């Protein structure tokens, strides 16, 4: 599906900011089962990385690793003119489910239902 250009609205800036805040929880859940944990500095003995900081305190030397492969999906939707509308509610998954008291809040995986627009959007972005 060829795509030419886009004039996006100013509202579409906080999706990518809120992505990493929720993706770092799954990264912590992935790497906590292994022998990886917060520490002082990167070293093979202590099993420390530079990514292992809070989701807000991500260094400038790596930020695009989280934020790259999301926005190139929205071109195929919004260029043809698909919709990304929103209700007035907003924060919903806060209720419905280590420095700084960190720990993951696992969203459920064994519950999902699909329809025309939903399967369409999922297949469009994964495509």
């Amino acid at each position: 599906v060829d795509t030419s250009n886009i004039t996006i609205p100013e509202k579409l800036e906080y999706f990518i900011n809120k992505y990493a805040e929720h993706s770092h929880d799954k990264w912590s859940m992935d790497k906590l089962a292994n022998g990886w944990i917060y520490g002082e500095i990167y070293s093979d003995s202590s099993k420390i990385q530079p990514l292992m900081k809070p989701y807000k305190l991500l260094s400038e030397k790596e930020k695009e690793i989280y934020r790259w492969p999301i926005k190139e999906s929205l071109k195929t939707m919004l260029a043809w003119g698909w919709r990304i509308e929103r209700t007035r509610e907003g924060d919903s998954m806060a209720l419905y489910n280590a420095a700084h008291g960190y720990s993951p809040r696992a969203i459920d995986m064994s519950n999902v239902t699909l329809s025309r627009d939903l399967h369409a959007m999922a297949e469009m972005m994964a495509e």
């Binding site: 919709r83 509308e85 929103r86 919903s92 969203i107």
Partner: peptide
Amino acid sequence: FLQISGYVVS
């Protein structure tokens, strides 16, 4: 993360 986060598309 997109769908049931206070989001509707129609």
